[PDB]
Design goal:
Chain E: InterPro entries: Ribosomal_uS4, Ribosomal_uS4_CS, Ribosomal_uS4_euk/arc, Ribosomal_uS4_N, S4_RNA-bd, S4_RNA-bd_sf. The structure is cut from a larger assembly and holds chains A, B, C, D and E. Chain A is an all-alpha fold. Chain A contains 1 helix and no strands. The structure holds magnesium ion (30 copies). The structure holds 2 RNA strands.
RNA sequence: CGGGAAACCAAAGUCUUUGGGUUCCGGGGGGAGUAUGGUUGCAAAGCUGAAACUUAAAGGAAUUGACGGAAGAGCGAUUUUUGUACACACCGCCCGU
RNA sequence: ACCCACUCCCGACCCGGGGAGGUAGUGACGAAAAAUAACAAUACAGGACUCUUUCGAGGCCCUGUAAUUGGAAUGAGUCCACUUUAAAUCCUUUAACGAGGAUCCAUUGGAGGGCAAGUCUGGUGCCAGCAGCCGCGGUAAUUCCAGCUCCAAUAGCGUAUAUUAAAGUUGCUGCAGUUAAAAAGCUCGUAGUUGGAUCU
């Protein structure tokens, strides 16, 4: 068929600049944060387990 | 039933050797017709010259126009239809260009909606399609 | 506030597009994992 | 198509080939 | 022909199932408790324990009076007692199957520096070791995975050249003193 | 009695508690029992017998419905007769020019 | 590219020669070790602890989170010297300089299921595209193009192809042949395979 529509959507998306964030830790420090966040620091729950990235 | 004699080793070995030929994959790997018919000749990748750009209609129940290229291999001269996978990457390929082509992932079998297409484009004009897509490298020109 | 009920979502969307998701939620409600 | 008539059609086509594809030719 | 050697081997095995929740939780607990850098450090000790268990299981199928069993199980038990994972009262070949990975994890230099009070954290212990502050009876060791033998346990100290072990002050102290 | 997906089978039993003897023979659905070679026959045809290519299912047993120019027990779905290749349910499905 | 210093070989030879060989250069084939931060005070939040029945109470302890504060420790680098070597290089050893955004910035793939992780927001509208497979996309897309956030391994991670396990889907261990693929139309019969008890 017609090949004139190649790249249609990617060239239609409005450009959005990435924001500036503080650099992430690496190596042992990242694993220390994950360990402290998943097991050391826990809040009481009523059985409705939520995922790390739950929203609404 | 199978023979369980103490001196039946020849019978068992001969029967297994003869019945291995009814396995599709064993016969495909050991017969030699598939290797002869394979355009790559057993290689993982190949280089070709882009003959032209084509659009292949996606099989039902999907509706789309998959952008592909007809190319001709340099080592044997065979003609091949390769898929250019990304949003708008067909504008990175020009005619008479040299492209690197690899398999589609299913060992000579068609993948997804695209009928009869088993190859995909990797690099065009000696630069990878990923780098062009992400804007890390430009066309040599 | 009670916003999402896993039982109702599973019983409603078990045959819809979002079945594989809601099932995955319901198990999280049941086994705690 | 019924397998019997498919077999008969194949046989008739083979006979037609044999007449056309003569051994003398 | 060259005068080189090509003998080498891998020290770990990756798990068959990439995404298993229970395995991920257990390995992350181990990493957090012992201050490890990544998952590969857990897999290395798991591989070592697996090899020891395989040797012990192969020696348990022989007759009790077999000379090779008597010679090699004795050596294996002696090495395990030497490194400190086993006890003197438990020097039978069956008790090897009752060993766990935490027993081997407790014998690293990183955890022993923390347990002896030289560091105030396991991560602080790793940092101290990697920065050449710790010596083992004469020698400055900066390898956290150093496995401490029993007879060396008493001989872990600060190095003589360390600012902590009676040495000259470091770069920052000298610069700050020069400031004022 | 025990088997088996079940229909059913005293054999289709004595099978992860897996070995009495031995012959033939199968390896997802098509292409195809087709092409070619060999061989047999007066002929029709018989025996042996591919590949390139194509496809995500085809198929077995049973259940509830819908149709018809028919009359406590089961692994489990499940718990007027009957047949079904239908389940968007005969306004169905489907074959060849 | 450098050398016969090592290993050895040849010659009339203790002395000569050797792209054999050794040493450097290129080198993410691959294998081993291992940085990218640690601590303290504050400011908040949880637990134990006590007294107060409850409102409550605390440096009274333990643990978490801050481009909030502070001063300590370091090697990556630059670089004298020694050592290394045939002469060097590298490693090791050591002077001096060398970290707060410690900007001395970690990447590669994913976020429907298989399979760890968002039916959050903005575009597009069976188009562009994704998708190994099932599938998504036809105006409220958990799947495309993006922002944010979140997962996995980590100085490594994707892709194509050959091969092994998974495959008790080649079955000797150990598969099937009524209806799912399948026992020759039937009988005879050579080779092959197998073959009843009994001797202290
Ligand atoms: Mg569609
Ligand atoms: Mg059996
Ligand atoms: Mg077949
Ligand atoms: Mg096929
Ligand atoms: Mg009941
Ligand atoms: Mg019951
Ligand atoms: Mg009927
Ligand atoms: Mg019915
Ligand atoms: Mg020499
Ligand atoms: Mg000489
Ligand atoms: Mg040379
Ligand atoms: Mg050479
Ligand atoms: Mg490596
Ligand atoms: Mg860095
Ligand atoms: Mg990413
Ligand atoms: Mg996204
Ligand atoms: Mg997934
Ligand atoms: Mg999940
Ligand atoms: Mg499909
Ligand atoms: Mg929208
Ligand atoms: Mg949206
Ligand atoms: Mg295999
Ligand atoms: Mg197996
Ligand atoms: Mg197979
Ligand atoms: Mg077995
Ligand atoms: Mg089978
Ligand atoms: Mg049949
Ligand atoms: Mg019969
Ligand atoms: Mg005979
Ligand atoms: Mg006998």
């Amino acid at each position: 068929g017609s090949l004139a529509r190649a790249g249609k959507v990617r060239g239609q998306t409005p450009k959005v600049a990435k924001q500036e964030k503080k650099k992430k830790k690496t190596g042992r420090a990242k694993r220390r944060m994950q360990y402290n966040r998943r097991f050391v620091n826990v809040v009481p729950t009523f059985g409705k387990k939520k995922g790390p990235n739950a929203n609404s | 039933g199978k023979c369980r004699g103490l001196r039946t080793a020849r019978k068992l070995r001969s029967h297994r050797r003869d019945q291995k030929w009814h396995d599709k994959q064993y016969k495909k790997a050991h017969l030699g017709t598939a290797l002869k018919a394979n355009p790559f000749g057993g290689a993982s990748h190949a280089k070709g010259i882009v003959l032209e750009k084509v659009g292949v209609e996606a099989k039902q129940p999907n509706s789309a126009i998959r952008k592909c290229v007809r190319v001709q291999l340099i080592k044997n001269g065979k003609k091949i239809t390769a898929f250019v996978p990304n949003d708008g990457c067909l504008n990175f390929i020009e005619e008479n260009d040299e492209v690197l082509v690899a398999g589609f992932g299913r060992k000579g079998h068609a993948v997804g909606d695209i009928p009869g297409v088993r190859f995909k484009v990797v690099k065009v004009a000696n630069v990878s399609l990923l780098a062009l897509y992400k804007g890390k490298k430009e066309r040599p020109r | 506030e009670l916003g999402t009920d896993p039982y109702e979502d599973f019983q409603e969307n078990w045959n819809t597009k979002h079945s594989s998701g809601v099932t995955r939620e319901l198990m999280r409600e049941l086994n705690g994992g | 198509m019924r397998a019997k008539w498919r077999k008969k059609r194949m046989r008739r086509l083979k006979r037609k080939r044999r007449k056309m594809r003569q051994r003398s030719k | 022909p060259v005068a080189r050697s090509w003998v080498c081997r891998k020290t770990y095995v990756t798990p068959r199932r990439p995404f298993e929740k229970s395995r991920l939780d257990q390995e992350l607990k181990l990493i957090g408790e012992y201050g490890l850098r990544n998952k590969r450090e857990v897999w290395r000790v798991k591989f070592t324990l697996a090899k020891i268990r395989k040797a012990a299981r192969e020696l348990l199928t022989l007759d009790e009076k077999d000379p090779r069993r008597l010679f090699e199980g004795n050596a294996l038990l002696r090495r395990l007692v030497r490194i400190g994972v086993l006890d003197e009262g438990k020097m039978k070949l069956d008790y090897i199957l009752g060993l766990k990975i935490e027993d081997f994890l407790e014998r690293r230099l990183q955890t022993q520096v923390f347990k002896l009070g030289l560091a105030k954290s396991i991560h602080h212990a790793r940092v101290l070791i990697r920065q050449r502050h710790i010596r083992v009876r004469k020698q400055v060791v900066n390898i956290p995975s150093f496995i401490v033998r029993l007879d060396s346990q008493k001989h872990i100290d600060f190095s003589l050249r360390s600012p902590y072990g009676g040495g000259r002050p470091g770069r920052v102290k000298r610069k700050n003193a020069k400031k004022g």
